């Protein structure tokens, strides 16, 4: 035991102003200058001192009976006062500036230790904390995890951000939930040994080979967002997956996903996908991200009646009509495609967010009854009219229609042209292969506001 | 334009913390480099930093387990600011819904309920009522759906089961004959309230019944 040598002012025990204020309330005193006894201090067994701007825990060594502490969201560096508090079983100290965790080395009763978002490199002092079942070390600067190799009760683990070598995990077969995000990992072969894994988060790494996952059939949650994946054949073994993120990879072949019918969320944004036929039987999906691929035909999507959230932006899609039966849709994004007809979207009476900039849309009238919209995008349309004949005097109908059914007057017209509703007219002295015009019109549908703008090209035949 | 999925999280989520919720994105990130941030209770006002965002990815994370019975929903706002320091979106309101787990046992309104009953009250006579509440979500789950039972009677005379309880309402009725004040003036019942329609978490309290002339 540590003991104060006599009754002492709280503020002479706890030299931190903010910690002293807290301990005054904990210890049932009126003023931080009031004295307390060692007996009073020995009554404190838990302490929730998160989010108080504490810079020093000097004084806590005299709280001999502590079992659980929260000092998260503070400004701690030195944690030497924990050194002899061997009754500690749970420590929360995420979001500090701790570098030296040597004072933890003898706290062998610890079962939970949260240290993410600190300045830790060296984790050798954790090596004898063999009763840990939860250890979080992400958002640090750890490169070497050999000190984890003897923590064979671990169930929940994370670390970062410089690890390449995962071999120290080999014996931690009690692991259920692992986050190795934002390291330097390419080789995940050791993970095949962790057959109790239910959740694996491994975003922002250099992983290309996922064959090690093959026997990890208890996986329900897997994130490989931001890696170098292409062959995902191994995922066909993981039929318990409900939540899968493979965004930001090089995947083209989705056939291995076709049997993962427990999937409710699937992210496949920023890949090399042109064929989503393999997704047609994934009817439990509520969330599907297919942005930044090479899609044209999205007809397999019409089967996915439970979708509430769908991204399709940055593809080469002309026909949006496969979404038309997905009436639970609340948020739909398909900006940067080639959609010219949104008549099918009239069906999406539950739609709230509708994002359709950089398409070929000319007529908002099908959207007019979508009054639950709160977010809308219709900027920067562009399309080419069917050719008309070059003549000295040549007129075409304006075809740009607001949600009201009213024609939107051109903003600009090439080659000195003019507008008299409904017709755009050019006097052209000699043959030109095309003329053009722009429009730009703010519009609100429901509560969703955008600028409906675009560039229309009119080819002229010789 | 914002590109954000709706955000729901169960309470009492398992670690490791922090956990990824959703990616937050503006489609104006194609015109330049965007700094993302969040404001609101649970972000930049108390409790601060329950929710945080990765600066460039827009990954929104939760740093600790939630408790629906303390805060059931959070209202955050996302912000998007260019490298030159100008906002490129208006702040977007983001609702975070915390969904229920059965983590509260029923709680009796009293530890000791008192009632009385007349000798020779007819079988079927309502005597008293006991009542428990449950802090879990009675709208979307059975986590607060309480069944009432009797565990014991003291004394067990003249019969073991002098009384019954309505498993839905907690009303305690006489169901047999032979009440006798002179011999057995009082009955101490242990009553149990259990959620999940009787199958779940449970709590016990006492009902003390005085036999009157
Ligand atoms: Ca908008
Ligand atoms: Ca709770
Ligand atoms: Ca309950
Ligand atoms: Ca609950």
XYZ file of C-alpha atoms and ligand atoms in Angstrom:
679
model
C 0.000 0.000 0.000
C 0.913 3.628 -0.513
C -0.160 5.922 2.327
C -0.169 9.659 2.952
C 1.819 10.313 6.133
C -1.134 12.204 7.736
C -4.422 13.897 6.811
C -3.608 16.080 3.773
C -5.383 18.726 1.604
C -6.840 17.081 -1.500
C -5.030 19.660 -3.666
C -1.656 18.693 -2.134
C -2.323 15.030 -3.014
C -3.741 15.559 -6.522
C -1.506 18.286 -7.985
C -3.643 18.467 -11.141
C -6.277 21.245 -10.708
C -8.939 19.342 -12.679
C -8.211 15.995 -10.984
C -8.274 17.690 -7.539
C -11.736 19.171 -8.306
C -12.971 15.721 -9.342
C -11.469 14.005 -6.277
C -13.102 16.578 -3.987
C -16.539 15.490 -5.329
C -15.571 11.794 -5.272
C -14.401 12.143 -1.653
C -17.519 14.053 -0.519
C -15.673 17.262 0.424
C -16.616 20.923 0.009
C -13.247 22.470 -0.928
C -10.174 21.112 -2.714
C -8.249 22.570 0.285
C -10.128 20.245 2.709
C -8.015 17.455 4.248
C -8.661 13.752 3.661
C -7.268 10.630 5.373
C -5.694 7.482 3.871
C -8.903 5.694 5.025
C -11.049 8.004 2.863
C -8.713 7.372 -0.115
C -8.904 3.593 0.369
C -12.721 3.724 -0.179
C -12.359 4.639 -3.880
C -12.606 1.497 -6.046
C -13.738 3.019 -9.384
C -13.053 6.417 -10.996
C -14.629 7.956 -14.107
C -12.388 10.963 -14.795
C -12.763 11.136 -18.567
C -12.915 14.457 -20.429
C -11.653 16.805 -17.646
C -8.492 18.268 -19.251
C -6.311 16.325 -16.757
C -2.553 16.647 -17.418
C -1.236 14.649 -14.438
C -2.531 11.739 -12.338
C -0.080 12.415 -9.478
C -2.029 11.393 -6.344
C -3.767 8.312 -7.806
C -1.059 6.006 -6.377
C -2.744 6.570 -2.948
C -6.049 5.180 -4.243
C -4.848 1.677 -3.409
C -8.171 -0.092 -3.949
C -8.881 1.013 -7.542
C -10.235 -1.739 -9.833
C -11.618 0.339 -12.785
C -10.519 3.739 -14.132
C -11.558 5.916 -17.036
C -9.070 8.680 -17.905
C -9.958 8.780 -21.593
C -10.069 12.116 -23.439
C -7.475 13.918 -21.278
C -3.888 15.218 -21.753
C -1.955 12.477 -19.910
C 1.671 11.732 -20.715
C 3.185 10.218 -17.547
C 1.241 7.319 -15.996
C 3.859 6.271 -13.415
C 1.237 6.608 -10.560
C -0.586 3.439 -11.821
C 2.606 1.385 -11.192
C 1.533 -0.351 -7.973
C -2.281 -0.291 -8.363
C -2.298 -4.069 -8.861
C -6.055 -4.469 -8.181
C -6.771 -2.706 -11.540
C -8.789 -4.905 -13.930
C -10.031 -2.313 -16.489
C -8.267 0.848 -17.814
C -9.700 3.301 -20.337
C -7.069 5.855 -21.481
C -7.747 6.400 -25.187
C -7.113 9.926 -26.494
C -4.117 11.057 -24.470
C -0.439 11.673 -25.288
C 0.957 8.596 -23.537
C 4.255 7.246 -24.907
C 5.692 5.162 -22.068
C 3.489 2.320 -20.816
C 6.213 0.790 -18.598
C 4.057 1.554 -15.466
C 1.506 -1.070 -16.682
C 3.982 -3.968 -16.696
C 2.946 -5.440 -13.307
C -0.843 -4.861 -13.538
C -1.417 -8.583 -14.219
C -5.060 -8.470 -13.042
C -5.903 -6.353 -16.118
C -8.556 -7.910 -18.350
C -9.306 -4.706 -20.308
C -6.882 -2.059 -21.580
C -7.891 0.725 -23.977
C -4.956 2.879 -25.222
C -5.891 3.881 -28.774
C -4.993 7.383 -29.967
C -1.805 7.857 -27.948
C 1.924 8.097 -28.858
C 2.908 4.488 -28.111
C 5.719 2.712 -30.000
C 7.046 0.213 -27.458
C 4.564 -2.363 -26.125
C 7.066 -4.744 -24.514
C 5.582 -3.753 -21.054
C 2.301 -5.539 -21.985
C 3.976 -8.946 -22.413
C 3.070 -10.365 -18.956
C -0.527 -9.049 -18.910
C -1.736 -12.531 -19.804
C -5.290 -12.077 -18.429
C -6.153 -9.368 -20.993
C -9.216 -10.141 -23.093
C -9.678 -6.646 -24.595
C -6.715 -4.575 -25.802
C -7.015 -1.588 -28.134
C -3.848 0.042 -29.492
C -4.884 1.652 -32.831
C -3.738 5.215 -33.687
C -0.274 4.743 -32.189
C 3.125 4.188 -33.870
C 3.666 0.491 -33.105
C 5.773 -1.572 -35.554
C 6.536 -4.641 -33.431
C 3.837 -6.802 -31.821
C 5.996 -9.715 -30.525
C 4.919 -8.664 -26.999
C 1.335 -9.816 -27.821
C 2.378 -13.415 -28.496
C 1.716 -14.572 -24.900
C -1.676 -12.858 -24.450
C -3.649 -16.064 -25.047
C -6.894 -14.834 -23.404
C -7.344 -12.001 -25.930
C -10.813 -11.873 -27.510
C -10.798 -8.302 -28.847
C -7.634 -6.717 -30.244
C -6.476 -3.767 -32.310
C -3.163 -2.022 -33.004
C -1.327 0.297 -35.386
C 0.053 1.954 -37.327
C 3.383 0.509 -38.573
C 3.015 -3.284 -38.232
C 4.063 -5.493 -41.137
C 4.681 -8.747 -39.233
C 1.544 -10.467 -37.861
C 3.331 -13.710 -36.889
C 3.087 -12.899 -33.104
C -0.708 -13.452 -33.380
C -0.282 -17.184 -34.159
C -1.175 -18.437 -30.661
C -4.017 -16.050 -29.794
C -6.698 -18.523 -30.906
C -9.234 -17.026 -28.449
C -9.462 -13.917 -30.725
C -12.988 -13.132 -31.949
C -12.706 -9.498 -33.041
C -9.588 -8.140 -34.685
C -8.809 -4.723 -36.180
C -5.478 -4.440 -38.056
C -6.515 -1.349 -40.080
C -3.930 1.181 -41.285
C -0.744 -0.842 -40.858
C 1.750 -2.005 -43.506
C 0.295 -5.486 -43.797
C 0.396 -7.565 -46.956
C 0.767 -11.035 -45.469
C -2.313 -12.180 -43.512
C -1.444 -15.918 -43.563
C -1.274 -16.022 -39.706
C -5.040 -15.191 -39.555
C -5.907 -18.738 -40.733
C -4.895 -19.818 -37.204
C -7.543 -17.577 -35.622
C -10.512 -19.853 -36.359
C -12.756 -18.162 -33.738
C -12.719 -14.804 -35.606
C -16.197 -13.326 -36.043
C -15.091 -9.820 -37.043
C -12.035 -8.789 -39.044
C -11.389 -5.135 -39.876
C -8.305 -4.729 -42.100
C -8.841 -1.487 -44.038
C -6.050 0.568 -45.608
C -3.387 -2.135 -45.927
C -1.554 -3.785 -48.853
C -3.429 -7.096 -48.900
C -3.814 -8.965 -52.178
C -4.097 -12.606 -51.026
C -7.137 -13.546 -48.919
C -6.760 -17.333 -49.168
C -5.844 -17.366 -45.407
C -9.482 -16.411 -44.624
C -10.813 -19.658 -46.145
C -11.357 -21.610 -42.877
C -12.514 -18.555 -40.877
C -16.132 -19.563 -41.469
C -17.418 -17.881 -38.266
C -16.806 -14.474 -39.885
C -19.955 -12.352 -39.869
C -18.183 -9.006 -40.463
C -15.261 -8.336 -42.817
C -13.770 -5.042 -44.021
C -10.943 -5.079 -46.579
C -11.649 -1.492 -47.699
C -8.538 -0.019 -49.356
C -6.219 -2.907 -50.227
C -5.063 -4.598 -53.458
C -7.745 -7.297 -53.813
C -8.633 -8.938 -57.128
C -9.254 -12.695 -56.639
C -11.940 -12.957 -53.956
C -12.711 -16.678 -54.609
C -12.057 -17.444 -50.929
C -15.100 -15.365 -49.849
C -17.416 -18.102 -51.160
C -16.487 -20.124 -48.002
C -17.680 -17.368 -45.649
C -21.446 -17.995 -45.767
C -22.016 -16.421 -42.331
C -21.019 -12.929 -43.606
C -23.731 -10.275 -43.125
C -21.531 -7.160 -43.498
C -18.853 -7.025 -46.214
C -16.744 -4.032 -47.322
C -14.451 -4.586 -50.322
C -14.418 -0.952 -51.514
C -11.245 0.565 -53.043
C -9.716 -2.588 -54.570
C -9.229 -4.065 -58.080
C -12.122 -6.583 -58.035
C -13.971 -7.510 -61.232
C -15.297 -11.059 -60.614
C -18.191 -11.124 -58.074
C -19.220 -14.767 -58.693
C -17.720 -15.770 -55.260
C -20.317 -13.512 -53.546
C -23.368 -15.115 -55.135
C -24.042 -17.545 -52.244
C -23.520 -15.097 -49.354
C -27.297 -14.678 -48.948
C -27.014 -13.465 -45.328
C -25.408 -10.224 -46.603
C -27.387 -7.123 -45.590
C -24.608 -4.609 -46.369
C -22.156 -4.821 -49.233
C -19.686 -2.112 -50.293
C -17.998 -2.545 -53.690
C -17.251 1.076 -54.597
C -14.035 1.895 -56.502
C -13.338 -1.477 -58.141
C -13.320 -2.844 -61.735
C -16.860 -4.313 -61.843
C -18.883 -4.471 -65.091
C -21.183 -7.415 -64.234
C -23.400 -7.601 -61.120
C -25.382 -10.694 -62.179
C -23.774 -12.588 -59.195
C -25.497 -10.168 -56.737
C -29.046 -11.036 -57.981
C -29.822 -13.516 -55.163
C -28.584 -11.292 -52.312
C -32.144 -10.242 -51.444
C -31.424 -9.427 -47.766
C -29.301 -6.387 -48.877
C -30.399 -3.016 -47.492
C -27.142 -1.210 -48.392
C -25.279 -1.630 -51.675
C -22.407 0.555 -52.906
C -21.379 0.133 -56.576
C -19.966 3.610 -57.266
C -16.773 4.058 -59.306
C -16.954 0.838 -61.368
C -17.602 0.184 -65.078
C -21.308 -0.710 -64.879
C -23.715 -0.321 -67.775
C -26.459 -2.922 -67.333
C -27.763 -2.798 -63.745
C -30.798 -5.060 -64.356
C -29.742 -7.651 -61.649
C -30.453 -4.902 -59.096
C -34.257 -5.161 -59.595
C -34.270 -8.290 -57.401
C -32.979 -6.397 -54.347
C -36.315 -5.202 -52.931
C -34.984 -4.525 -49.413
C -32.507 -1.854 -50.571
C -32.827 1.470 -48.743
C -29.384 2.828 -49.711
C -27.778 2.507 -53.162
C -24.768 4.161 -54.799
C -24.122 3.942 -58.549
C -22.222 7.186 -59.202
C -19.291 7.194 -61.643
C -20.340 4.369 -63.943
C -21.521 4.199 -67.569
C -25.245 3.561 -66.890
C -27.901 4.675 -69.428
C -30.966 2.875 -68.100
C -31.784 3.611 -64.437
C -35.144 1.824 -64.641
C -33.993 -1.347 -62.746
C -34.195 0.719 -59.501
C -37.884 1.475 -60.229
C -39.319 -1.390 -58.137
C -37.027 -0.686 -55.111
C -39.661 1.361 -53.298
C -37.921 1.210 -49.907
C -35.120 3.330 -51.424
C -34.422 6.401 -49.297
C -31.039 7.482 -50.745
C -30.046 6.955 -54.370
C -26.864 8.348 -55.968
C -26.104 7.987 -59.693
C -24.269 11.197 -60.566
C -21.732 10.837 -63.394
C -23.658 8.400 -65.637
C -25.580 8.707 -68.987
C -29.198 8.620 -67.729
C -31.547 10.683 -69.948
C -34.927 9.427 -68.685
C -35.880 9.509 -64.998
C -39.556 8.661 -65.586
C -39.090 5.410 -63.612
C -38.023 7.366 -60.497
C -41.628 8.614 -60.058
C -42.086 5.230 -58.268
C -39.663 5.977 -55.432
C -42.184 7.680 -53.146
C -39.916 7.067 -50.076
C -36.891 8.787 -51.639
C -35.187 11.419 -49.484
C -31.778 11.888 -51.152
C -31.615 11.906 -54.945
C -28.265 12.671 -56.538
C -28.225 12.801 -60.349
C -25.739 15.507 -61.435
C -23.634 14.888 -64.571
C -26.208 12.803 -66.397
C -28.220 13.670 -69.544
C -31.447 14.724 -67.810
C -33.633 17.270 -69.638
C -37.070 16.941 -67.973
C -37.729 17.056 -64.211
C -41.496 16.520 -64.487
C -41.313 12.793 -63.391
C -39.790 14.019 -60.102
C -42.631 16.418 -59.256
C -44.462 14.242 -56.685
C -41.300 13.184 -54.767
C -42.122 15.577 -51.937
C -40.198 13.649 -49.254
C -36.909 14.696 -50.897
C -34.541 16.518 -48.507
C -31.376 16.306 -50.635
C -31.192 16.782 -54.382
C -28.501 17.075 -57.080
C -29.162 17.916 -60.760
C -26.141 20.077 -61.699
C -24.092 19.767 -64.910
C -26.218 17.709 -67.270
C -24.948 17.312 -70.833
C -26.402 15.738 -73.975
C -26.426 15.835 -77.761
C -29.704 16.306 -79.655
C -30.504 14.274 -82.744
C -29.059 16.193 -85.756
C -31.154 18.784 -87.574
C -30.359 20.296 -91.019
C -27.913 23.173 -91.366
C -29.744 26.203 -92.733
C -28.889 29.920 -92.827
C -31.832 30.331 -90.481
C -32.209 27.314 -88.188
C -34.488 26.930 -85.139
C -34.944 24.107 -82.641
C -37.382 23.604 -79.721
C -36.026 24.237 -76.254
C -36.603 20.909 -74.462
C -35.346 21.807 -70.953
C -38.326 21.394 -68.600
C -38.461 22.362 -64.911
C -40.357 20.253 -62.337
C -43.338 22.609 -62.931
C -43.528 21.545 -66.613
C -42.362 25.042 -67.666
C -39.524 25.417 -70.171
C -36.275 26.749 -68.649
C -34.905 29.623 -70.724
C -31.274 29.217 -71.945
C -28.517 30.852 -69.890
C -26.180 31.095 -72.918
C -26.586 30.268 -76.621
C -23.652 29.756 -79.008
C -23.005 31.750 -82.175
C -25.151 34.808 -81.331
C -28.356 32.712 -81.155
C -31.535 33.968 -79.481
C -34.571 32.550 -77.663
C -38.276 33.203 -78.249
C -40.173 30.648 -76.153
C -40.323 27.850 -77.151
C -37.686 28.081 -79.932
C -33.920 28.755 -80.082
C -32.864 30.416 -83.383
C -29.451 30.964 -85.031
C -28.529 33.094 -88.041
C -25.475 31.188 -89.327
C -23.619 32.847 -92.284
C -21.971 29.565 -93.331
C -22.067 25.844 -92.426
C -21.066 24.806 -88.907
C -21.142 21.208 -87.665
C -22.760 22.073 -84.315
C -24.326 24.803 -82.237
C -25.113 24.666 -78.529
C -26.716 26.284 -75.502
C -26.612 26.131 -71.713
C -29.187 26.412 -68.955
C -28.875 26.997 -65.233
C -31.905 27.039 -62.925
C -32.059 26.641 -59.103
C -34.897 24.316 -58.082
C -36.319 22.796 -54.905
C -38.268 19.519 -54.804
C -39.761 18.842 -51.397
C -37.017 20.307 -49.168
C -34.125 19.358 -51.495
C -32.428 22.188 -53.365
C -30.043 22.129 -56.310
C -29.132 23.888 -59.517
C -30.518 22.145 -62.600
C -27.853 23.105 -65.141
C -26.517 21.651 -68.357
C -24.985 21.947 -71.823
C -26.933 20.902 -74.925
C -25.175 20.231 -78.245
C -27.143 20.377 -81.495
C -25.327 18.732 -84.491
C -26.172 20.269 -87.884
C -26.237 18.152 -91.092
C -24.518 19.545 -94.214
C -23.830 17.165 -52.317
C -23.392 14.910 -49.284
C -23.089 11.147 -49.749
C -23.908 9.569 -46.402
C -25.784 6.392 -45.355
C -28.267 6.419 -42.426
C -26.593 5.623 -39.088
C -27.946 3.095 -36.586
C -25.926 1.449 -33.813
C -26.897 -1.095 -31.092
C -25.983 -0.144 -27.548
C -23.295 -2.114 -25.681
C -21.327 -2.914 -28.866
C -18.291 -5.162 -28.373
C -14.795 -3.801 -29.030
C -12.195 -3.325 -30.210
C -13.001 0.404 -30.115
C -13.123 2.605 -32.030
C -15.665 1.195 -34.511
C -16.350 2.403 -38.061
C -19.951 3.537 -38.621
C -20.115 5.047 -42.118
C -18.008 6.990 -44.554
C -18.917 10.647 -44.945
C -18.262 12.236 -48.306
C -19.021 15.326 -50.378
C -19.176 14.835 -54.159
C -17.339 18.178 -54.387
C -14.140 16.350 -53.330
C -13.633 15.905 -57.098
C -13.040 19.681 -57.429
C -10.376 19.683 -54.645
C -9.195 18.474 -51.200
C -11.810 18.478 -48.428
C -11.449 18.650 -44.630
C -14.395 16.864 -42.900
C -15.550 17.474 -39.313
C -18.528 16.873 -36.998
C -20.305 19.030 -34.467
C -23.035 18.348 -31.935
C -23.714 16.528 -28.666
C -21.437 13.480 -28.648
C -19.008 15.241 -31.024
C -17.822 18.691 -29.960
C -20.232 19.225 -27.033
C -20.802 16.884 -24.034
C -20.156 14.047 -24.135
C -17.282 15.125 -26.379
C -15.649 12.691 -28.795
C -18.055 9.734 -28.467
C -18.169 10.230 -32.258
C -15.117 11.302 -34.288
C -14.225 11.568 -37.968
C -11.036 10.619 -39.871
C -10.087 13.907 -41.554
C -9.624 12.989 -45.221
C -11.489 9.626 -45.605
C -14.615 10.953 -43.901
C -14.818 7.707 -41.829
C -17.131 8.407 -38.878
C -16.302 6.293 -35.812
C -17.649 5.657 -32.314
C -15.013 5.552 -29.566
C -16.946 3.856 -26.758
C -20.086 1.732 -26.175
C -23.461 3.499 -26.256
C -26.328 3.227 -23.773
C -29.809 3.751 -25.231
C -31.246 4.396 -21.745
C -28.929 7.417 -21.305
C -28.951 8.806 -24.852
C -31.217 7.123 -27.412
C -30.369 9.344 -30.396
C -27.645 11.877 -31.193
C -27.995 14.771 -33.644
C -24.664 15.553 -35.326
C -23.757 17.888 -38.160
C -21.121 17.132 -40.800
C -18.973 19.931 -42.269
C -16.893 20.056 -45.464
C -14.189 22.694 -45.958
C -11.694 23.067 -48.845
C -7.906 23.191 -48.399
C -8.238 26.967 -48.880
C -10.562 27.270 -45.847
C -14.027 27.813 -47.405
C -17.029 25.598 -46.643
C -17.990 23.640 -49.777
C -21.262 22.246 -48.331
C -23.862 23.505 -45.881
C -23.668 21.451 -42.623
C -25.675 18.224 -42.912
C -27.818 17.075 -39.994
C -27.005 13.430 -39.168
C -29.260 11.456 -36.798
C -27.598 8.559 -34.963
C -30.146 6.069 -33.619
C -29.109 3.815 -30.710
C -30.995 0.474 -30.823
C -31.953 -1.544 -27.749
C -30.430 -4.558 -26.063
C -32.094 -6.267 -23.085
C -29.762 -4.882 -20.434
C -32.195 -3.700 -17.730
C -33.845 -6.055 -15.305
C -37.446 -5.205 -14.315
C -37.738 -2.958 -11.284
C -40.604 -3.224 -8.802
C -42.131 0.141 -7.835
C -41.779 -1.043 -4.210
C -39.554 -3.643 -2.545
C -42.464 -4.539 -0.204
C -46.074 -4.328 -1.336
C -48.781 -4.554 1.330
C -52.285 -5.932 1.010
C -55.028 -7.421 3.106
C -57.712 -10.085 2.723
C -60.801 -11.045 4.731
C -61.215 -14.592 6.093
C -63.580 -16.517 3.839
C -63.052 -14.158 0.913
C -64.445 -16.106 -2.024
C -61.870 -17.851 -4.284
C -61.289 -15.460 -7.173
C -61.286 -12.333 -4.941
C -58.664 -9.758 -5.995
C -56.488 -8.903 -2.929
C -53.725 -6.524 -4.144
C -51.483 -5.560 -7.042
C -47.728 -5.594 -7.591
C -46.063 -3.573 -10.346
C -42.685 -3.581 -12.088
C -41.284 -1.306 -14.803
C -38.529 -2.017 -17.333
C -36.198 0.685 -18.762
C -35.651 -1.217 -22.025
C -37.451 -0.508 -25.308
C -41.143 -1.392 -24.953
C -41.915 -0.109 -28.486
C -39.681 -2.244 -30.749
C -38.821 -5.251 -28.558
C -40.125 -7.545 -25.839
C -37.207 -6.372 -23.619
C -39.694 -4.630 -21.264
C -42.596 -7.139 -21.548
C -43.036 -8.369 -17.979
C -44.572 -11.607 -16.740
C -45.346 -11.880 -13.004
C -45.027 -15.095 -10.998
C -45.080 -16.126 -7.324
C -41.944 -17.987 -6.189
C -42.876 -18.783 -2.583
C -45.428 -18.359 0.209
C -44.652 -18.156 3.951
C -46.342 -19.784 5.757
C -47.408 -22.719 3.532
C -50.547 -23.189 5.665
C -53.270 -24.142 5.396
C -52.326 -24.708 1.692
C -49.100 -24.000 -0.262
C -50.921 -21.902 -2.847
C -53.423 -19.684 -1.059
C -52.990 -17.053 -3.785
C -52.295 -16.716 -7.487
C -50.991 -13.823 -9.571
C -52.175 -12.586 -12.962
C -49.078 -13.046 -15.076
C -49.850 -9.900 -17.149
C -51.279 -7.443 -14.599
C -49.589 -8.410 -11.317
C -52.983 -8.645 -9.574
C -52.873 -11.160 -6.720
C -56.100 -13.116 -6.027
C -57.193 -15.645 -3.333
C -57.649 -19.034 -5.014
C -58.338 -21.389 -2.115
C -60.236 -21.586 1.162
C -59.391 -21.715 4.849
C -57.872 -18.325 5.666
C -57.562 -18.074 9.442
C -56.305 -14.841 11.072
C -55.924 -16.500 14.503
C -53.582 -19.195 13.152
C -51.873 -17.481 10.194
C -52.300 -13.645 10.407
C -49.903 -12.850 7.551
C -48.555 -14.335 4.291
C -45.178 -13.316 2.845
C -45.032 -13.934 -0.909
C -41.937 -13.578 -3.033
C -43.040 -12.246 -6.439
C -40.929 -12.248 -9.619
C -41.079 -9.937 -12.624
C -39.273 -11.188 -15.715
C -38.993 -9.513 -19.127
C -39.072 -11.241 -22.550
C -42.619 -12.275 -21.592
C -41.311 -14.169 -18.557
C -38.291 -15.776 -20.263
C -35.722 -12.992 -19.755
C -34.034 -10.964 -17.006
C -35.725 -11.137 -13.619
C -36.129 -9.389 -10.297
C -37.954 -10.359 -7.082
C -39.833 -8.412 -4.406
C -42.100 -9.151 -1.431
C -45.896 -8.895 -1.038
C -47.124 -8.988 2.587
C -50.807 -9.880 2.970
C -52.618 -9.386 6.273
C -55.588 -11.660 7.027
C -58.444 -9.620 8.530
C -61.665 -10.613 10.278
Ca -28.357 19.803 -53.429
Ca -28.347 0.363 -21.650
Ca -35.405 -5.631 -19.717
Ca -31.559 -1.423 -23.154
